[PDB]
Design a protein around this motif. Structure first.
Motif, PDB file in Angstrom:
ATOM      1  N   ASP A  62       0.900  -1.166   0.000  1.00 43.78           N
ATOM      2  CA  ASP A  62       0.000   0.000   0.000  1.00 43.78           C
ATOM      3  C   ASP A  62       0.929   1.204   0.000  1.00 43.78           C
ATOM      4  OD1 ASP A  62      -1.142   2.343   1.599  1.00 43.78           O
ATOM      5  OD2 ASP A  62      -2.977   1.072   1.450  1.00 43.78           O
ATOM      6  N   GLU A  63       0.850   2.061  -1.022  1.00 44.73           N
ATOM      7  CA  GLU A  63       1.811   3.181  -1.194  1.00 44.73           C
ATOM      8  C   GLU A  63       1.914   4.037   0.084  1.00 44.73           C
ATOM      9  OE1 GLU A  63       0.500   7.059  -3.466  1.00 44.73           O
ATOM     10  OE2 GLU A  63       1.613   5.602  -4.751  1.00 44.73           O
ATOM     11  N   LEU A  64       0.763   4.297   0.705  1.00 42.28           N
ATOM     12  CA  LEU A  64       0.797   5.283   1.848  1.00 42.28           C
ATOM     13  C   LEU A  64       1.331   4.595   3.126  1.00 42.28           C
ATOM     14  CD1 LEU A  64      -2.535   7.188   1.175  1.00 42.28           C
ATOM     15  CD2 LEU A  64      -0.150   7.855   0.699  1.00 42.28           C
ATOM     16  N   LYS A  72      11.049  10.592  -7.131  1.00 39.88           N
ATOM     17  CA  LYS A  72      10.830  12.025  -7.093  1.00 39.88           C
ATOM     18  C   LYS A  72       9.537  12.340  -6.332  1.00 39.88           C
ATOM     19  CE  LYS A  72      12.900  12.700 -11.568  1.00 39.88           C
ATOM     20  NZ  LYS A  72      14.287  12.560 -11.154  1.00 39.88           N
ATOM     21  N   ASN A  73       8.969  11.327  -5.687  1.00 38.48           N
ATOM     22  CA  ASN A  73       7.673  11.544  -4.978  1.00 38.48           C
ATOM     23  C   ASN A  73       7.981  12.321  -3.652  1.00 38.48           C
ATOM     24  OD1 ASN A  73       5.721  10.777  -2.860  1.00 38.48           O
ATOM     25  ND2 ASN A  73       4.751   9.627  -4.481  1.00 38.48           N
ATOM     26  N   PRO A  74       7.349  13.505  -3.438  1.00 36.52           N
ATOM     27  CA  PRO A  74       7.620  14.285  -2.207  1.00 36.52           C
ATOM     28  C   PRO A  74       7.331  13.474  -0.968  1.00 36.52           C
ATOM     29  CG  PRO A  74       6.602  15.736  -3.756  1.00 36.52           C
ATOM     30  CD  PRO A  74       6.539  14.278  -4.392  1.00 36.52           C
ATOM     31  N   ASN A  75       6.251  12.649  -0.957  1.00 35.76           N
ATOM     32  CA  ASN A  75       5.953  11.901   0.226  1.00 35.76           C
ATOM     33  C   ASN A  75       7.084  10.894   0.581  1.00 35.76           C
ATOM     34  OD1 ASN A  75       3.503  13.205   0.318  1.00 35.76           O
ATOM     35  ND2 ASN A  75       2.279  11.393  -0.160  1.00 35.76           N
ATOM     36  N   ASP A  76       7.712  10.282  -0.419  1.00 37.42           N
ATOM     37  CA  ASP A  76       8.770   9.313  -0.122  1.00 37.42           C
ATOM     38  C   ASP A  76       9.989  10.037   0.390  1.00 37.42           C
ATOM     39  OD1 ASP A  76       7.279   7.137  -1.152  1.00 37.42           O
ATOM     40  OD2 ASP A  76       8.156   7.314  -3.164  1.00 37.42           O
ATOM     41  N   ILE A  77      10.368  11.153  -0.258  1.00 39.44           N
ATOM     42  CA  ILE A  77      11.584  11.900   0.179  1.00 39.44           C
ATOM     43  C   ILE A  77      11.372  12.428   1.604  1.00 39.44           C
ATOM     44  CG2 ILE A  77      13.143  13.792  -0.317  1.00 39.44           C
ATOM     45  CD1 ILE A  77      12.207  13.273  -3.291  1.00 39.44           C
TER      46      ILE A  77
HETATM   47 MG   LIG Z   1       5.120   5.517  -5.746  1.00 36.06          MG
END
Ligand SMILES: [Mg+2]
Ligand SMILES: N=C(N)NCCC[C@H](N)P(=O)(O)O
Ligand SMILES: [Mg+2]
Ligand SMILES: [Zn+2]
Length: 889
Positions: free
Chosen positions: A761-763, A796-801
């Motif tokens: 689940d990505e989140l 480049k996903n802000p949530n991952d960084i």
């Molecule tokens: Mg992703």
């Protein structure tokens, strides 16, 4: 770099009456055709016509259907399109253009961009100029008629503002939809979305006009069953604006859309609100508990903007706090009423006094209405939002509910459909103030200083009681430290909500009272006070100030036990902890400085430990409140009280104080961790997607807080409990089992188990990354390198960084490693990020905001890294302005 000044505001020499857009999305490019129906305004003086347009590839531009010639009639420099006035018409005319843009490679996430397989716009504050030419400023109000076309298989769902008026097939597997939005709006509230979106929907019937409103919530197909809570929150938000403010939604449909790549929170585009997926999607299985309050807050906030931002609009970006501080205040009133837990207000105060007070004593300090900017992107700050919210809430404190409601309705009635400035709000509240005082000579002119003066006021107290006269006096003083923005600070209008507690029986001695302090100092006298009271000061945290209560710890303990106001009890506890922290920090610092071979530490007050145990053992007391009392003040709150803060000495000070209390209370903590299990982890409603119990989630907070205290302490056999907790159905619990296992040999076993539970689940995977990043590991630097190589990579996903790096920056011992390796690592990530997303790069600068508060070695190490970033030839304008202002250069 151009500086924009608030006092330089002047209306445009042009009018844009109508925008007609055709946005044709293709595999490798999007072509945007736009016709602007324009006019010359009464302010016109024969100037060049200058449009904003950033990064646009011009195919052609025209006036009244004749092509203009580059060089001779116009210049375009990738930022401004300038049409020389000799070629600009003197009456109504059409300007038309066709440009090419590239949402697939738009990783800055401003303008039109691709998030996974959805195309989405983000226009606030200056993103519309990345889509097409415009006079991109919020006072340019226009009607919009927008057509979007795209591949039908890839983009079956097409959305923009207003009514969908036509849908059509196009040869080559394409289709189109036309949306017409006749009411005027600023360009920042334009949005478009295209994608293979799935939805939930409901009908809401308004309270007064009984209008049917269609509510749609959208996401990618994978996550569509995480949308139900958001839809319930949207209904609650509509109901609350109806109930508290008498305000109904004016349109026939409201769409909410979740996207995976987004720059923090959500965006209030009119009838088409777009959200960071982390602030719209949740399920009981795949979300931690915090998601539930977050979605309620963000859906509510974007809903409330429909009046405070979208119907009453801003004149210019200097007025940002008028929509944001007021919407955050409306959001906070809503969340308080929906959660019914005292921790909702406490959590807002905890945020303000750590993060926003640190901002306001930093080189970045600004008033909630700034006087100048270079990048509006750098002014969406905790000061503008959260101090702005506390300024908006003080009018309610000063007026009371009935007159606040009257004043608010004055503001809405008078400014609905028009632009507004902070003065117009203050005027409305003043009219209510005149009514309340019953005197038309009363004004709030002094109140305006909350908008223009930067820095946090300090409010300090002295007392006097005369036992024979039964007369009690409170002597109050205010002071704001001078800073770069005002040499001379003036006294503010500070409302002080107070009670007087009888120390013998805990009872209130006076009715509700709010002292209005309007001078540098004042003395408030009360007669017929039968015994010397303990004063309960700033109830509800009634002004955004440093409170210096000058109470003894005995008096603070009495308030903590017996006061009626949650903030004052929490604050009394906070003030006991701060007095202990500053004392032990200085004892540790002297021992380090003097290289002592032995020394003494002042122990933690025993009666204070007793008061904590008394509260924890009270079965009628609130679990969320209990979790605050066993937690020391946040590091960022502490730092406001210490100069040249040595972070190792502060870490040793916190260790001592936590160990002192645990050495007395750990058996109590273990007993409660066990006795709370039944209710905290109750699965009765786990499969009821709409049943959200804030009290139960506060019980889980308390269990997880106690579990952390016991694990750090190496309480006997607590690993048995950690392992059992890892098997909980609730991600709040099983992610907690990962963080507390840091202190045992089982950490990497739970790392793997929890990764497995999160990876699909990505989140939830992002919450796993935050858990790993925040883990109290001696080998945290090696663990971060493992996350980078194995999970993050070149996302480049802000949530991952943000998930990988920000929690680590809070690790007091390790981020602040004296080698400077933590500062070096974050600086490298900032510079790497700045190449594609300058906003997120600036967000990743957050640990540097306290650089000039630390010990002189760490100051130098941080300054070194900031100057290295500043020296990057390819530095963005947003990152450069930020770091110049932060480093006083
Ligand atoms: Mg992703
Ligand atoms: N420059 C930004 N941080 N983005 C602006 C979008 C902020 C939204 N108005 P909200 O305050 O509703 O999240
Ligand atoms: Mg371009
Ligand atoms: Zn907002």
């Amino acid at each position: 770099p151009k500086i924009h000044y608030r006092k330089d505001y002047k209306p445009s020499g042009f009018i844009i009456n109508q925008v007609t857009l055709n946005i044709n999305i293709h595999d490798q490019e999007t072509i945007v055709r736009s016709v602007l129906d324009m006019d010359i305004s009464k302010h016109n003086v024969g100037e060049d016509l200058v449009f904003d347009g950033v990064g646009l590839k011009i195919n052609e531009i025209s006036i009244n259907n004749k092509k203009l010639v580059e060089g001779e009639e116009y210049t375009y420099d990738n930022e401004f399109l300038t049409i020389f006035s000799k070629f600009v018409p003197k009456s109504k005319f059409a300007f038309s253009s066709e440009v090419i843009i590239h949402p697939e490679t738009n990783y800055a996430l401003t303008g039109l961009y691709k998030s996974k397989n959805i195309i989405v716009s983000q226009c606030e504050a200056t993103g519309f100029r990345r889509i097409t030419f415009f006079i991109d400023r919020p006072d340019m109000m226009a009607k919009y008629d927008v057509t979007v076309t795209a591949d039908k298989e890839k983009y079956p769902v097409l959305l923009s503002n207003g009514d969908k008026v036509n849908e059509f097939e196009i040869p080559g597997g394409r289709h189109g939809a036309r949306f017409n939005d006749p009411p005027l709006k600023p360009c920042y509230l334009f949005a478009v979305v295209a994608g293979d979106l799935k939805h939930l929907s409901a009908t809401y019937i308004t309270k007064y006009t009984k209008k049917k409103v269609e509510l749609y919530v959208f996401s990618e197909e994978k996550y569509v069953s995480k949308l139900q809570w958001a839809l319930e929150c949207l209904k609650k938000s509509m109901a609350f604006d109806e109930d508290y403010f008498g305000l109904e939604y004016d349109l026939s449909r409201l769409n909410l859309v979740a996207v995976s790549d987004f720059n923090v929170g959500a965006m209030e585009n009119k009838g088409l609100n777009i959200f960071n997926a982390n602030s719209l999607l949740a399920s009981k299985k795949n979300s931690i508990d915090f998601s539930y309050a977050r979605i309620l807050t963000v859906v509510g906030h974007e809903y409330f903007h429909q009046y405070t931002g979208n119907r009453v609009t801003l004149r210019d970006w200097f007025q940002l706090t008028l929509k944001e501080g007021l919407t955050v205040h409306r959001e906070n009133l809503f969340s308080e009423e929906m959660t019914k837990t005292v921790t909702t207000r406490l959590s807002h105060v905890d945020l303000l006094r750590s993060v926003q007070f640190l901002e306001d004593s930093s080189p970045l300090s600004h008033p909630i209405r700034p006087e100048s900017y270079v990048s509006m992107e750098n002014f969406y700050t905790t000061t503008v939002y959260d101090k702005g919210s506390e300024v908006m809430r003080m009018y309610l404190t000063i007026l009371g509910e009935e007159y606040y409601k009257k004043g608010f309705d004055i503001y809405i009635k008078k400014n609905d459909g028009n632009t507004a400035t902070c003065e117009d709000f203050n005027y409305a509240m003043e009219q209510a103030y005149k009514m309340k005082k019953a005197d038309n000579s009363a004004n709030l002119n002094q109140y305006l200083l909350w908008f223009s003066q930067s820095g946090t006021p300090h409010v300090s107290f002295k007392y006097n009681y005369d036992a024979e006269k039964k007369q009690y006096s409170i002597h109050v003083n205010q002071y704001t430290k001078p800073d770069e923005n005002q040499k001379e600070k003036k006294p503010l209008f500070i409302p002080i909500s107070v009670g007087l507690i009888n120390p013998e029986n805990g009872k209130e001695m006076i009715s509700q009272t709010t002292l209005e302090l309007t001078k540098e100092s004042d003395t408030f006298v009360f007669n017929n006070i039968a015994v010397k009271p303990i004063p309960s000061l700033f109830r509800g945290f009634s002004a955004p100030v440093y409170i210096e209560d000058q109470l003894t710890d005995e008096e603070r303990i009495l308030l903590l036990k017996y006061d009626s106001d949650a903030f004052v009890r929490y604050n009394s506890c906070t003030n006991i902890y701060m007095k202990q922290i500053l004392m032990n920090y200085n004892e540790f610092l002297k021992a380090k400085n003097e290289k002592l071979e032995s020394f003494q530490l002042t122990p933690v007050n025993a009666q204070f430990i007793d008061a904590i145990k008394y509260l924890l053992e009270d079965p009628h007391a609130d679990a969320g409140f209990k979790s605050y009392i066993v937690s020391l003040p946040q590091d960022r709150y502490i730092i406001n009280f210490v100069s040249n803060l040595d972070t190792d000495v502060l870490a040793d000070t916190k260790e001592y104080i936590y160990k002192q209390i645990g050495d007395k209370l750990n058996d109590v903590y273990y007993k409660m961790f066990k006795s709370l299990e039944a209710k905290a982890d109750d699965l009765t409603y786990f499969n009821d997607e709409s049943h959200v119990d804030f009290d139960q989630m506060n019980m889980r907070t308390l269990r997880n807080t106690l579990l952390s205290l016991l694990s750090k302490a190496q309480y006997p056999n607590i690993l048995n409990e950690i392992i059992e907790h890892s098997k909980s159905p609730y991600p709040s619990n099983w992610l907690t089992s990962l963080s507390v296992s840091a202190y045992f040999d089982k950490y990497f076993e739970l790392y793997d188990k929890t990764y497995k539970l999160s990876k699909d689940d990505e989140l939830l995977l992002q919450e796993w990354l935050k858990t790993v990043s925040r883990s109290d590991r001696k080998d945290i630097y090696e663990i971060l390198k493992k996350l980078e190589n194995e999970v993050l990579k070149d996302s480049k996903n802000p949530n991952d960084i943000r998930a990988v790096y920000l929690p680590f920056t809070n690790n007091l011992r390790r981020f602040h490693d004296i080698s400077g390796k933590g500062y070096k690592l974050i600086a490298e990530v900032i510079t790497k990020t700045d190449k594609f997303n300058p906003m997120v790069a600036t967000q990743l600068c957050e640990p540097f905001k306290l650089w000039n508060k630390l010990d002189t070695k760490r100051q130098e190490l941080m300054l070194n890294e900031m100057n290295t970033m500043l020296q990057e030839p390819q530095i963005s304008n947003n990152l450069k302005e930020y770091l110049l202002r932060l480093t006083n250069k």
